[PDB]
Amino acid sequence: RLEALRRFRLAEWRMVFYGLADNDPLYPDQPILLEDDTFFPRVNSAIKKRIETKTLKRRDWAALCSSYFAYQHQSPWCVLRGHIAQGYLVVKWMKTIEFYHDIFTPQAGGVISRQLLASLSSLEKIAQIPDSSWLWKRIFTVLLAQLDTLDDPQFLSKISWLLGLAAQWVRFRDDIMTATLTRYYHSGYRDQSHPALKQAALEYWDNPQKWHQVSESVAAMVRGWLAKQDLTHFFELLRGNGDVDQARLHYWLRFANQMGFTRIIMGSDAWQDRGSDFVKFREENKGRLSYLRGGRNFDNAMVMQINDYLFVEFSGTGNAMYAYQIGHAPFNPESRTLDINIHLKDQGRCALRLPHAPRAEGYNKVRITGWMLKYDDELRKLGIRWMAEEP
């Protein structure tokens, strides 16, 4: 195809077509078109010379498009972008760059991004854009920069598509996700569930307790569900042979906006539960769930991290909670197998022991009662307390 370059020195529509198209499958050793050593001045003149002609039907201009529409680097090199910016007037392939200059400035990515967000697919009739940072990046640096607008009864729906964009676009996966959660923060959904980002962000890279390399004011937003989901499931789904423990739930779900790390510990019968209910439970949060040894077949536990101390809670009604200092524990919280006595209930290695007595009645979110009233008093006298997030 690219043999037209030999006769391209002459300066009928398709005889010069492949003298300006994508380069250079025929000679891969040949560098980019405007860094060619032997054809740099030839194209700069021949393209210019054909412009002054009043009428043109040649396909070289559309061929000129492909070699710069699919141009990778983002220099906007713009000299031949200038000629094509004016060349399509005298040819009236005038539809080649109709919306390619939709913004008419070197900072491209105009309404071409608005078609997808509200093309990279329908524009292949003139030239294909699989990987060219001139259009590929600059069309997604706009549709992500416009997340700060558009109404939000369908923004949640648009994440599902926007998470879908992170599915095939491998490079934009670390750029869409980097800015999908940032807008999800400022929207007003600081503390409401969104498993799709929760799953997708965890899959794409590790959530500490790699995100810090986004900010730490936005990572903790969904961390409010790596904390809350570990609480809700533990006190409602992993209740063991007993009923739901509301008494331990409300007082502990209260302090969910400051929790940094959480980890559920399973039971013996839980892995003997062949039903998918615990299978998806073990699959939805893979890598955050662990096995339990040395305890009863229905025993359950948590590893809890707070601002100043590491906390352990158990599903057995009447078991005192064990507390460890942060970074000071006989067990690895990320270990897949743990023991109640060897690791969790090591009295010689634990710091604080407090039974859940006396029993509390009349519990409410703002009105506090019973043992957790004293539990609140011990913590309120020294620091963090109950504060509702900005409504």
- When computed from its CA atoms, the radius of gyration of the chain, rounded to whole angstroms, is 31
Which residues have a Cβ under 8 Å from the Cβ of 122 and sit 6 or more positions away?
A: none
Q: Which residue has the tokens 């509702």?
A: 388
169 within 8 A of 140, measured Cβ to Cβ:
yes
Do residues 276 and 355 lie in contact, with contact meaning Cβ atoms separated by under 8 Å?
Answer: no
**In b/e form, how buried is each residue of 30-43, taking b as 16+ CB within 10 angstroms?**
beebbebeebeeeb
Decide: residue 370, CB within 10 A, 0-12 exposed, 13-18 middle, 19+ buried: middle
Is 177 in contact with 222 (CB distance < 8 Å)? no
Locus of tokens 């200059």: 101
321-325 sheet: strands from edge to edge: 337-339, 289-293, 262-265, 301-305, 309-314, 321-325, 352-354
Contacts of 129 (CB under 8 A, 6+ apart): 69, 70, 120, 123, 135, 136
Take residue 32 and report the two structure tokens written for it. 């980019």
Distance, CA of 303 to CA of 227 (rounded, Å): 11
Determination technique for this entry: cryo-EM
CA 105 to chain centre: 30
The DSSP bridge partners found for residue 302 are 264, 313
Task: Return the closest-CA partner of residue 23 out of 48, 11, 41, 40.
Answer: 40
Using an 8 Å Cβ cutoff, are 155 and 120 in contact? no
d(CA 127, CA 120): 10
Q: How far apart are CA 169 and CA 189, in angstroms?
A: 26
Give alpha helix (H) positions in the chain: 4-7, 40-49, 60-69, 79-90, 111-117, 136-143, 155-168, 170-187, 195-204, 216-236, 246-254, 268-271, 276-284, 370-380
Query: Whose structure tokens read 């990987």?
Result: 131
DSSP-derived secondary structure for 301-316: EEEEE-SSEEEEEESS
Closest CA to 386 of 225, 254, 190: 254
Number of H helices, E strands in the chain: 14, 7
Q: What angle do CA 246, 250, 253 make, to 5 degrees?
A: 125
CA distances from 325 to 81, 288, 304, 330, 337 (A): 63, 20, 11, 11, 21
Q: What resolution in angstroms, rounded to 1 decimal? A: 3.6
Question: Angle at CA 202, nearest 5°, toward 196 and 203?
Answer: 90
Nearest to 68 by CA among 60, 221, 94: 60
Q: How far apart are CA 39 and CA 41, in angstroms?
A: 6
Q: CA 45, CA 213: separation in Å to the nearest integer?
A: 47
3-state secondary structure of 289: strand
Cα separation of 90 and 60, whole Å?
13
The tally of CA atoms less than 13 A away on the side-chain side of residue 240 is 15
Phi, psi of 317 (to 5 degrees): -60, 115
Residue 263 host element (H or E): strand 262-265
Only one residue has tokens 């920069």, namely: 145
Give me 182's structure tokens. 């940032």
The DSSP call for residue 352 is E
